[PDB]
Write a protein that binds this ligand. Structure first.
Ligand SMILES: C[N+](C)(C)CCOP(=O)(O)O
Ligand SMILES: C[N+](C)(C)CCOP(=O)(O)O
Ligand SMILES: [Ca+2]
Ligand SMILES: [Ca+2]
Ligand SMILES: [Ca+2]
Ligand SMILES: [Ca+2]
Lengths: 165, 165
């Protein structure tokens, strides 16, 4: 689409020990923001360990963009409460995507991003080459909230027509 | 593009009782085609009941287009052998994708395509609203071969941009 390098697939896997925002539980959904783009998972009802396993799909024009991720507690007839947020860099994953990864076996670890004061990794993050595809695993520790983390996996979808990688 | 309705995610699940094309077995892969777009799954060795569990993501510009599908047996030092062909319409899926289905319980069946003499359905194919997504499960009986069917699921991907539906 005349800048599009392709499509970043953010597999939102699960939230672990998310914060309580209705008495006893929460109705968490995730909002992803990058540039003008804004994607949301479904609400999962009354579960602070929600298993979304939901794919959000963004278009990439910048190899060097931030993905902001925010969790909210859905309240149907009132205001939704904040449940924390994180952000992560996609540049390490895009750099790795232009790397000629043929030949390397399944399970080849190609880049490692480490937890820093300034990033939201709870663990170090593995850009792993597996089954012919380049995948990055993320455990994001949410900011600005008393507990919780979200597990995600980045994957990549090529778009025929676009500017390419 | 600008012309894009969205992306059809075709999940190739597995093959069942596929035909033998190496003396005693086969190394089958699935190839898919819509318009000028062609995609294939990876090869499974020596298995006439392969579990592919692989996505093939196509660009949809034409609601009324048809997906062609074939299975071939990979031969390392020869022309690959035929294992059958099928095809299916995306129109009933796309039209139902337009429906406003929130509030409906996960598991609601929304349309049912019947098997007919002229289509390749082994079973009536249902379009179901599950986990906040419209999905269509297909069992495709392979043509021009002595046995085999392919199980697949249709999912839709909407792109930020796009004509959309
Ligand atoms: C694995 N693959 C199907 C994607 C490529 C190889 O297939 P082929 O070499 O048998 O044609
Ligand atoms: C089967 N064949 C080798 C003759 C053609 C298959 O090639 P492809 O369309 O799977 O890339
Ligand atoms: Ca609340
Ligand atoms: Ca709530
Ligand atoms: Ca053969
Ligand atoms: Ca063979």
């Amino acid at each position: 689409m005349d800048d599009l390098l392709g499509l970043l697939r953010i597999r939102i896997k699960r939230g672990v020990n998310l914060a309580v925002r209705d008495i006893s539980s929460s109705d968490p959904y995730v909002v992803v923001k990058m540039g003008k783009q804004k994607l949301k998972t479904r609400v999962i009802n009354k579960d602070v360990n929600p298993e979304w396993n939901e794919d959000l799909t963004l278009s990439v024009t910048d190899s060097n963009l931030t993905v902001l991720l925010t969790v909210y507690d859905h309240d149907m007839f009132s205001k939704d409460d904040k449940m924390g947020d994180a952000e992560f860099e996609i540049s390490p994953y895009i750099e790795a995507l232009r790397m000629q990864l043929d030949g390397l076996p399944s399970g080849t670890i190609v880049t490692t991003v480490k937890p820093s004061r300034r990033n939201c990794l709870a663990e170090e993050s593995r850009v792993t080459w597996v089954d012919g595809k380049l995948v990055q695993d993320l455990v994001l520790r949410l900011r600005h909230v008393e507990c919780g983390e979200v597990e995600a996996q980045l994957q990549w979808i090529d778009l025929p027509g676009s500017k390419g990688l």
